[PDB]
Paper text:
MCM8 and MCM9 proteins are structurally similar, with an MCM domain at the N-terminus (NTD) and an AAA+ ATPase domain at the C-terminus (CTD). The structures reveal that MCM8/9 is arranged into a heterohexamer through a threefold symmetry axis, creating a central channel that accommodates DNA.
And the 3.95 Å structure of the hMCM8/9 NTD ring was reconstructed with C1 symmetry, in contrast to the structure of gMCM8/9, which has C3 symmetry. We also found that the structure of the hMCM8/9 NTD ring underwent a large conformational change when compared to the previously described hMCM8/9 NTD. As a result, the two conformations were designated as Conformation I (hMCM8/9 NTD at 6.6 Å) and Conformation II (hMCM8/9 NTD at 3.95 Å). In line with our observation, when superimposed these two conformations of hMCM8/9 NTD, we found that one of the trimer interfaces in Conformation II was expanded by ~5 Å. This expansion further pushed its neighboring MCM8/9 heterodimers to shift to either side. The left dimer translates downward by ~8 Å and tilts by ~6° while the right one shifts by ~7 Å and tilts by ~8°. Interestingly, the ZF of MCM8 shifts by ~3 Å to the left, and the ZF of MCM9 shifts by ~4.5 Å to the right, resulting in an overall expansion of ~6 Å. While in the Conformation II of hMCM8/9 NTD ring, the OB-hps of hMCM8 and hMCM9 lose their C3 symmetry without significant conformational change.
Numbering used by the authors:
A (entry chain F), B (entry chain A), C (entry chain C): 63 to 369
D (entry chain E), E (entry chain B), F (entry chain D): 1 to 276
Amino acid sequence: QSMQSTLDRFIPYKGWKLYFSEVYSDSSPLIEKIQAFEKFFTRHIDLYDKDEIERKGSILVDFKELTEGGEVTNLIPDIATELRDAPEKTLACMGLAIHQVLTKDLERHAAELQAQEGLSNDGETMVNVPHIHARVYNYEPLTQLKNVRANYYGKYIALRGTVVRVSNIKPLCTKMAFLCAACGEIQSFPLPDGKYSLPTKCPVPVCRGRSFTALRSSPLTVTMDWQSIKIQELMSDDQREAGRIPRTIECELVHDLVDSCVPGDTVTITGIVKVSNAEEGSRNKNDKCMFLLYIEANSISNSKGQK
Amino acid sequence: QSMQSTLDRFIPYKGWKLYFSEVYSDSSPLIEKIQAFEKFFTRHIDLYDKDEIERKGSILVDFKELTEGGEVTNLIPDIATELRDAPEKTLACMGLAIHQVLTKDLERHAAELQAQEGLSNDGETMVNVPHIHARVYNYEPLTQLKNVRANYYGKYIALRGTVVRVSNIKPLCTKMAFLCAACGEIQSFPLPDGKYSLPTKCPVPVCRGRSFTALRSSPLTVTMDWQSIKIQELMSDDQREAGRIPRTIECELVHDLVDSCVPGDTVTITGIVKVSNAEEGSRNKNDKCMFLLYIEANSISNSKGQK
Amino acid sequence: QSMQSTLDRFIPYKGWKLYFSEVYSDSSPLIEKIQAFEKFFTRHIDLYDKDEIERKGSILVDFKELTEGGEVTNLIPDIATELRDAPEKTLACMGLAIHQVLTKDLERHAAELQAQEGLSNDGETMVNVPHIHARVYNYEPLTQLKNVRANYYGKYIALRGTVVRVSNIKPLCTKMAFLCAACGEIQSFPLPDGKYSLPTKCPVPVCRGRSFTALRSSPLTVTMDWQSIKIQELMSDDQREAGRIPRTIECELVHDLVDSCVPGDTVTITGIVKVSNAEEGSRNKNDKCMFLLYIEANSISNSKGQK
Amino acid sequence: MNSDQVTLVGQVFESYVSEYHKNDILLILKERDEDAHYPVVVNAMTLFETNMEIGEYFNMFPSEVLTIFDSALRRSALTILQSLSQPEAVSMKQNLHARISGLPVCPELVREHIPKTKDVGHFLSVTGTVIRTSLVKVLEFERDYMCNKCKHVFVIKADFEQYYTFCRPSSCPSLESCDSSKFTCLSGLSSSPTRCRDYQEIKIQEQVQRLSVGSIPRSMKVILEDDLVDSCKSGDDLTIYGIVMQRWKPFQQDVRCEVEIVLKANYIQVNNEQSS
Amino acid sequence: MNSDQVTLVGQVFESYVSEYHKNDILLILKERDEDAHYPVVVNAMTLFETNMEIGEYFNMFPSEVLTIFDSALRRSALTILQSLSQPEAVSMKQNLHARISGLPVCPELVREHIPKTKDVGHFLSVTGTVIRTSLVKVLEFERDYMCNKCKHVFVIKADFEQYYTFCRPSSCPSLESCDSSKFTCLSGLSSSPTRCRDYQEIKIQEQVQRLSVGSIPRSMKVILEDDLVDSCKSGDDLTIYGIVMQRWKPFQQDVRCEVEIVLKANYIQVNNEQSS
Amino acid sequence: MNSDQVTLVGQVFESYVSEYHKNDILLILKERDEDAHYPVVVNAMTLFETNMEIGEYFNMFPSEVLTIFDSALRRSALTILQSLSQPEAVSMKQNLHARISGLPVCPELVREHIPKTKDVGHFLSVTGTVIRTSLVKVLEFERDYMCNKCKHVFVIKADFEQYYTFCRPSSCPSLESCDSSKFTCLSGLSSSPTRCRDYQEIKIQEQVQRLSVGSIPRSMKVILEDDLVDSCKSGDDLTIYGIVMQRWKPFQQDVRCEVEIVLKANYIQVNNEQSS
């Protein structure tokens, strides 16, 4: 196009806006991180099976694998430090990077089939790639549940615990398609932490009208399977302080992660703790703030499952 | 007949306007049917006793006998189809037929009794007719509870069932005395199904005031006792697979019907099926509407086997 | 002139402001009554201890002893009628007379010290004794819990009751510092009752600002310990039928009286009965609010404690 | 209603109550508490016999007749106050009450079972054992309202809404329309026994020995007014003479209207005591 | 779904109906009630053999294809009506629904596990034993909300996606901009039998044998509609042929929004009954 | 609360902490985490002994003195930070907390019974047994409020004694202050770990030995901040030394303020583990 010679060169995803709410910035550290994650992913792609990854919509990656891969370590000196300070940014960077490797792999797929069998199109073929999000498991710190406090909030942490409870899968709308009343264009809006929100301004540049229509029916809306697991630290009675119940921290699963959890089984969940929604401080402005930490699982790793 | 007194007299049924908003017309189909019912009612002098209609505000008609009569058959090729097609309209017209007879009969009786005394005992004669509802029982077409469906709704149905429970009698305001603030005048205002409503404007042409005050103290409000019975299809192994749940349908009972049947006794309940709002989300009717099927029962007859 | 001299000339006591919000006037009869009570107190000064009264913040004065003293009898024929008709005014009056007597005794001691040797005070102690609530014991009329009623409220009465239980002491805001937002001027505002109230009137007469801000942190706010206790009618088989329902009255025990009573110990209570709005009041918020009988014990004498 | 006839009813009542008053009248000066309000019990049958018109009026407008009876009782006390053996001995009570006993029995008048919607708004007699009695409570039976701008004092009795709530008046009493959110009260200004009058709530379960065992047992609220509170004993058969009346919850738009049959008791008599 | 293709798909179905459903058409003539919901059972595999295009189309858009089949059914009924000596004798039902049976097994077409959000909009066959059956309710398929100024909106369908509830719109429903202050729902005051549709939810639960031991079987609500309703009974394993859908709770700003997985069932055939 | 008195008292406090608790300050600095407020223990009786005047100031105005105490530990920590050879080994501490122990015996200074309102606002020693321990919750002790109109960033703490509820201030505290009708605050928009502090509630009641015979034990809320939370165990007796600050729900006009004497837990000792 006029703006960029290659759609990919200017923006890693050709459909950048739908995939990423954030706009591309050359200056921003996140784009460099995406490149490092991508390079690591390209090296690990041969091990990965493309078809399996495409159906899953997610790829499980060990934190140990991430640390071992050279490019990520070179670009950001400590992956772990980066994860605690900006958990969302790093997780998103990882997801875009794997998705980009997959888009490139899809382009490669088209090229190889065209070479193998003569095609009328012979190139010029649209390639369809499902959204892929990186999953991180076996995060190194492995902090205990008792340690978690107000300071711990906002930092990506790994929790060692046994889930005792599971919840029935509930589809959660990661993105809700929104059509402004005065504009033909409809754009999906990411819901922060799967929580309903309305953009003040319409995404389309030509019309900025506030009013929106929620197109749940439309394919543009994205629904991701979501699960909730209550995970409690497990300790020997002698090891634990006597007379105090083991702390239980709510954890959640998304996409392919869901349904890999069975109650009574020890599963390590790695992800970012978040201040609890629907609590009195959150619900009411000018109210006493009472909050609890709920941690998403970037990846699911089950010690019991591995056995 | 511009004057209200003259119009009421000219019209065959004096209190019909209060009972029904709809205005009878020669062109309208309902009126010929009320005439047919009236001829049938007069022929069955034994069936209708004026005191009985006055006391309970109702008459009970065996449907088979009603269909058998030639006059209604002349008016409608099948009386049964019409009852199914327009249960409310046929009921209103049937109710009108008994009511017209009641108004004429009461007035005639008063005139005959007081002719010797004076012109109607030298005083105004007021009918003071009770609200008249036609109750039809022994309905020949019979539908089992499983059969009842959305298509069945809006048509008269006959079912056999056991009443699980009876509600405590609750006053329900059929009419509400309403004083327009500007008018300073209290008018009884019909409340649909004993559900609170506010008049948009004062009925009189001179006053258009929106504000209305509901005066409980004022005599104009009419309160009617309300009872609810739940009816469950009798479970028989021949009729249904053993352990099939009996469908349970609520019955709204008002006026004479209240306390009609002792619970735990199988009865034949004949009524027009109606829909009521079980819930509206959390008081948001426009956003969320939930409707639950229930059958309003015009007449409850003890089951023949039980008898 | 400051007017301090005029204030001293019209009323010897300068503690009147603490005792009552009302600006005092010479015409009012309470000052004449104060002189009479104070004269009796001068006769009883030897019996009384100045230090004890000052630390206690209250004086134990027999109802009988006041009646016997001649000067008080001359001013008012019987103290008891004054006490019931206007319990608060009389209590303040007796306390003020005690304050005047106590201050005068101290002034005399300082004057004597000045005569013996040069004194910085040179007489004029300016003790500024804290408000003393006169506690009158052995009040002749006796009112039982069954006897107590709405008519009784507003009358000082002697009540005998048994404490079912003692609730946790809760601070009651006797006074609240209030700062006019525009003025920046803080006036301690006696809260009329436990319920929060705002004074539109500014402390300064010349500059008036309606807007006022509650200032609990400021020293002007006074919180008085209040003990909520429920006293059942004393139950004796000879006195009343066994198994009779107890009549229980909630009681307020402010100031010195807090915690004087012991649960399960019969205590003779002499106090004003004041009806108290139920906190819940009418469940649906309404102009009307529900009320419950309450008593405040001006004097507590423990029958169990002292036999 | 012109109420000229009801006022005449009060005058007839005064002559009728004169005999009751002397026994009631005696010891009023003797009574220590002038503030205390004392009920005077007048037989309903006795009023009916003294004048058919007063009895019929009581059936037709029980609340109005009772208020007139109370005013007449006050007037009779004034006459008694005028003549006394000793000025100091005489006791004068500002508030006097009319309590009705031995009311005539008619099927509509006395119903063991729950009063119907047709029965509502009419005097009813209920025979039942009280399941539960709430504790003695006080209510602002009369509340003074003074609009600050109007500066005139006007008082309105509370209506029969749930909790016996009252609504603030739109206009000032002295020939003007003035509305104040804050209405000054005599009780607020200084303690007033008159403003606050005790009220009680009890629920009466109708006699279990109905003609039909199948018919549901019914519980009816009974409201005690003034001196009547605390007379009843829980778990005992109670004979209640009262005006059954609508109790109305605040109406909500497009929500089914609900009203309830609640008796306000003119007088309480213990059926269990009559039996024993 | 190209429009010209849609007529062609209907034509293919119509020819297939003539050979396959002569008996079904005879049954349709026998029942005289058009309003009553009625099912014509078509074996999917044979129809798919007749038209390859129809088979592919069904998989991508089952709902659209079912609609085409229904339109073809009406056309087939009129031709049958003409073929019969008496048009009056043969009865044609407006509520005639093609029921898909004998689907060729495909992972998408037949999936044993409880359906997921990814599978929404795709036909699925799941054998289901229902733990809980909700009571029948009737919720209007279409509501006649009318914007008075516009005069163009009638029988607007209730939105299944928003928890099967229509949402009244402040903006005019019709494209023409003629907004009105008053919006009237004809259906709300009186619902036509056609306008309303039966609504039921059954908690289809995964068979224990299919799931791993020690793992809870998943349960999903299944919509039962029209004739199919009440065929299923709790505790009975019946194959459910249906298209997955999503039901959304009303969204609230600044709080999480809940989406619930659901399946609308095109056809119900009980495997337990088939096993006999 | 004289400014000179607090300045003088602060200098003495700094000297006292350096002479006796320098090692404790070093230990508090040493732990790698600096985010939690760190307890620094001081002994009251010795402070009174060293300077008579400062001890009296502490008795007269403990809350202001406590802020000075806190500033003194922080200033002493800064001098210690300059002194320590290795920054890594002894980490800089973001925040510090102050504990006062060993109050000189006085009837007012140590009371077994719950603190009275007369002595509210005064440091005292109480002995209590924990009945209830609330689960740890995240509360932001300091909440950022930003004036949209003046574009100035300031921090306003959630008011203690308002049940920890922050209050919007339309006018900014700073000299460049413009009243803002609408407040846009980044801190309000996003929760921050630094803004939040650990909050727990401890209910402490008198020990059986402690309570007077025949008298019910009285329980007072204890507010634990940061490090104090989780130290306590339910069913474990505690010796609590703290200033008592009455805590109230925000009041409404004509509504009684529910205010309870609450002892801020300035110092926590386990009575059950050690009597002293």
